[PDB]
Structure 1
Amino acid sequence: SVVSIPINNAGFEDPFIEVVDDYTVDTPPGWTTYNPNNLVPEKRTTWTSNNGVGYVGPGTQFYNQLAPEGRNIGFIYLAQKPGSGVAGFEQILDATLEPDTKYTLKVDVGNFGGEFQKISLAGFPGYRVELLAGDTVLAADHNNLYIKDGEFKTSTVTFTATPDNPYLDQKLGIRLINLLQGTFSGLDFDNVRLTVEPA
């Protein structure tokens, strides 16, 4: 009844990262950078706005648990002040929107804690998880879960497409967004899952 829709690098496991608490600052393979407000530069370093992948394993200062799936998470850090806009990850899938089908999108959202180069990582920017067809946000969880520093929680987004939906046959998409509505203005995501079932 319930079928999984394939997602590339759905757990941010590519690339492999060896050293505890290490990270990349380039867009994770299989994803693109969602950048509607031009907050993230094309060339990134540690302290520019950025996104990438990070290893969360034993030894980590960031959570009271390990990565929800595998070794790694995906993260977005925004250096601009709260209110400046949003940015995140986007992936357009090969699957298309089909009628009489209920879609369930799940992703784990992480509010890491700790301290980085004497800067407190306490606080959280807020998140939004979106399911798309074409350019249209069909359904989204805008920041409904309370996630304390050092923990992950699972966001669930659902959508049912009827035969009259204007966006049938358009490509499905997923966005994972840093809302930049608080500091420390970084957050993590892991274990993106998309399933389908009859409406």
Structure 2
Amino acid sequence: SAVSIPIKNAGFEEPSLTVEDYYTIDTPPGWITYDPNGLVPAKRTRITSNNGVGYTGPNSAYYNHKAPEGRNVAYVYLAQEIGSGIAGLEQTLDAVLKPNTKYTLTVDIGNSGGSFQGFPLDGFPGYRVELLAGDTVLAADQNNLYIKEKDFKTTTVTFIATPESPYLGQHLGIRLINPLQGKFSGVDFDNVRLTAEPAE
């Protein structure tokens, strides 16, 4: 029997947004911008690399169906050329890595489609989802799921920490990454969940 690990703003439902297709351009509350190649400015515009939340409802321009969870999805957009690097959202959790524990990290990934002000949203930069302890990537999935235009799909990253793990006691983390491997170079995320259960 699997226990949920608390995540802040796990569904990006904060801040609440009023109108369909509206969005913020500030880091979703409870999350941090992961920007190892310095592609995302502190003060963003609508044409810079940016991240935030977007109201995706039953009549979204960008997806067939509403947000997998609630009304909002998170998004990560990189303006720069392909190969310029990677960026995304990260959150350090209160839970620490425990031995003999199977961790299950699920998140829905969106390939926004259609168009914004005449600009085609066709194409996708890919995704990479990472479970961390300290500053170590313990386990990751990059692009194992194909995601159609205007669609979302759930991925699962799993990891088992042994008593021998050098990372026990270190704070867990979750990273949601735009690897900038295609244009249009926007990727969306929703419904982040992490569970712990006993393993052998």
* TM-score normalised according to structure 2 size: 0.99
Per the TM alignment, residue 59 of structure 1 is displaced from its structure 2 partner at its CA by: 1.9
Gaps of 5+ in 1: none
Aligned counterpart, 1:125: 125
The code of the aligned residue for 2:22 comes to D
User: Does residue 5 of the first structure (1) align with residue 28 of the second (2)?
Assistant: no
Deviation sequence 1:48-77 (CA, Å, 0-9, x none): 000000000122111111100000000000
Task: State the number of aligned residues.
Answer: 199
Matches within 5 A, 1:47-196: 47-196=47-196
Runs of 4+ in 1 over 3 A off after TM superposition: none
Per the TM alignment, residue 114 of structure 1 is displaced from its structure 2 partner at its CA by: 1.2
Q: Give the distance between the partners of 1:108 and 1:139, measured in 2 at CA.
A: 17
Deviation sequence 1:43-102 (CA, Å, 0-9, x none): 101110000000001221111111000000000000001110000000000000000000
The code of the aligned residue for 1:33 comes to T
Matches within 5 A, 1:35-50: 35-50=35-50
The code of the aligned residue for 2:115 comes to E
Q: Give the distance between the partners of 1:122 and 1:138, measured in 2 at CA.
A: 32
Per the TM alignment, residue 173 of structure 1 is displaced from its structure 2 partner at its CA by: 0.1
Q: Give the distance between the partners of 1:20 and 1:64, measured in 2 at CA.
A: 13
* TM-score normalised according to structure 1 size: 0.99
How well do the aligned residues superpose, as a CA RMSD in angstroms? 0.5
SS of the equivalent of 2:124 reads: coil
Q: Give the distance between the partners of 2:124 and 2:161, measured in 1 at CA.
A: 33
Deviation sequence 1:97-130 (CA, Å, 0-9, x none): 0000000000000001011121100110000000
Per the TM alignment, residue 172 of structure 1 is displaced from its structure 2 partner at its CA by: 0.1
Aligned counterpart, 1:33: 33
